[PDB]
Structure prediction request, 306 residues.
Amino acid sequence: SLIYTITLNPAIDRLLFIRGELEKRKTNRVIKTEFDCGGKGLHVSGVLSKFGIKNEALGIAGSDNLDKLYAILKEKHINHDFLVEAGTSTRECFVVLSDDTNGSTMIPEAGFTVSQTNKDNLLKQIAKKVKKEDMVVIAGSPPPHYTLSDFKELLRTVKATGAFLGCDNSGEYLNLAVEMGVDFIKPNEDEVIAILDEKTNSLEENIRTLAEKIPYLVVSLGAKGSICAHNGKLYQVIPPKVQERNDTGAGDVFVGAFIAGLAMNMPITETLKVATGCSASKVMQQFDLEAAGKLKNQVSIIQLEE
Ligand SMILES: [Mg+2]
Prediction:
């Protein structure tokens, strides 16, 4: 079996290193510029590759700066079969950071217009490639003009293959994934409440209720870690304390590692520890697989009763 990631709105992350903090209405001279692949789906492929788990990245990229994107991807050991949109360039996401601080400022470009031809080619790729024993992870918001309706088609096309389907989306797109009946999502507290539009039951009760539709539900609780519902049981994951260097792409590393865990047929509890371990290891970073291995064995998991 193989894992497929779907990045509907990939990007080329241009990291701009400055001195000190980013002061607005001032000149912030760039000390150095680094490049990285953008798009949640691609980040997931990156983590899975680091784990040595075979995967293939799918999505739509612009023709005009394709060589640049492809060069970065190889460098990150990411196998792909991207669709190419003629007459456009993949969007750039400017990430302002500094060796002197612990945060990052994001100024992402919107994304281009995907032709119906390419939306259709994506659906066809899924039908031709995805088998019942595979896993498909759609992560990241769609580009402009890729509608909720287009998303429905994408989700149903994956479902029709019988494969495991995980979604790391937001807003209306996340709500749609829940209505469509996916196998995995990683919403936060607020999103769980918004999906159910339930304001009077405990959060734990909201989670057990949503778990009736999502087999692998992981709700992030910011710094307190998270709560996971699976096979009728609820787990409270408490991450170890780490000094937080940059808490940005921690969510993508979690998903990548969580999926990795399942791919390696690890028990749910072990999977949660690995996922949380990698994420914490990423937090303390502007994600050492060795450090993640150690942090994993520092994560505590409490089942919660009833
Ligand atoms: Mg049930």
Notes: The first strand starts at residue 3 and ends at 7. Residues 212 surround magnesium ion (CB under 6 Å).
